[PDB]
């Protein structure tokens, strides 16, 4: 047919003309689906074989069924990813190849109970959580440093100020440093339509701190849309799970001492002031190191300054070359 070849050529020239244009926004996925094996894509052979835990970048507009995207992989070419409704449709198609998907079991029961599919067999039900296949995340991954122990204390404070000064100095002109004095662990998306929309409601949630924390969320988004790498100097988060289910999806950097024996004397070296909070300062270390390392993105398990320095320099270097 001539129409399919014509739309193929049109998509090809649109991709060629859109190779050098700014990226619009990014998406987050939670299902391992391949966009190259689907025959409904406008262009065959130019799909994306992306697994879960992956980020995609959208630049231009195609239709309500497919979009033009790019991978965070280095050297990844321009491909097409399904739309969220297209992903819902393909998820529905995934469970229809099986013998049964609704209530009527096939345990030697054919022709007795036809059981036409009710509203229970469609995606209308199972709406208690209903996690969307796509999540909105900042275009550039934010970087968060976790205290080897409770933030706001001397030892940890110098531990992250060293990295902050290094990223500022070596990488000036392309990285912006922002400090979040307020909390950031109260980032929720499926609680209510608008809890405390106005400050004049005099509600319990209106006069609480959740409004400012909610306002903190999107400024990270606008800083990410500027292509400039941004870090988060949050003084409240001390565990990856505290900021893992939110829509930020940040890069978490682990600065840790190899042994608590070294940490105790390192705390001792500060003075008598830290002796009072030393007791509670051990648990912030041991609970955090008990966390599995797969949650953490990068690990700094060494004690020399320059080796860890170049380690993180090269990590953000590979992140830089990933999206350029």
């Amino acid at each position: 047919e001539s129409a399919r070849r014509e739309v193929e050529s049109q998509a090809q020239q649109q991709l060629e003309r859109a190779k050098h244009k700014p990226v619009a926004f990014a998406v987050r996925t939670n299902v391992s689906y391949c966009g190259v094996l689907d025959e409904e894509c406008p262009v065959q052979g130019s799909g994306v074989n992306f697994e879960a835990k992956d980020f995609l970048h959208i630049k231009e507009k195609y239709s309500n069924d497919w979009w033009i995207g790019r991978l965070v992989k280095e050297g990844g070419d321009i491909a097409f990813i399904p739309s969220p409704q297209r992903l819902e449709s393909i998820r529905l198609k995934q469970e229809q190849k099986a013998r049964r998907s609704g209530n009527p079991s096939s345990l030697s029961d054919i022709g007795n109970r036809r059981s036409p599919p009710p509203s229970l067999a469609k995606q209308k039900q199972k709406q208690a959580e209903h996690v969307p296949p796509y999540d909105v995340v900042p275009s550039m991954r934010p970087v968060v440093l976790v205290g080897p122990s409770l933030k706001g204390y001397e030892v940890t404070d110098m531990m992250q100020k060293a990295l902050f000064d290094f990223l500022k100095h070596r990488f000036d002109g392309r990285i912006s440093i922002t400090r979040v004095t307020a909390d950031l662990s109260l980032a929720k998306r499926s609680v209510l339509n608008n809890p405390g929309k106005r400050t004049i409601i005099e509600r319990s949630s209106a006069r609480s701190s959740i409004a400012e924390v909610q306002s903190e969320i999107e400024r990270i988004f606008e800083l990410a849309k500027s292509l400039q790498l941004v870090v988060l100097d949050a003084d409240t988060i001390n565990h990856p799970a505290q900021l893992a289910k939110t829509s930020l999806a940040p890069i978490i950097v682990f600065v840790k001492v190899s042994s608590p024996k070294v940490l105790q004397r390192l705390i001792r070296s500060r003075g008598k002031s830290q002796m009072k909070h030393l007791t509670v300062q051990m648990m912030a270390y041991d609970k955090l190191v008990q966390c599995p390392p797969e949650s953490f993105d990068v690990i700094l398990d060494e004690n020399q300054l320059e080796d860890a320095c170049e380690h993180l320099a090269e990590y953000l270097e590979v992140y830089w070359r990933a999206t350029h």
Binding site: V155, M158, M159, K161, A162, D165, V257, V262, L266, S269, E302, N303, Q304, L305
Partner: peptide
């Protein structure tokens, strides 16, 4: 190693 780390980090506390 960690004392060197804290020394360099604390030295730049001046501003």
């Amino acid at each position: 190693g960690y004392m060197e780390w804290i020394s360099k980090a604390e030295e730049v506390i001046l501003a």
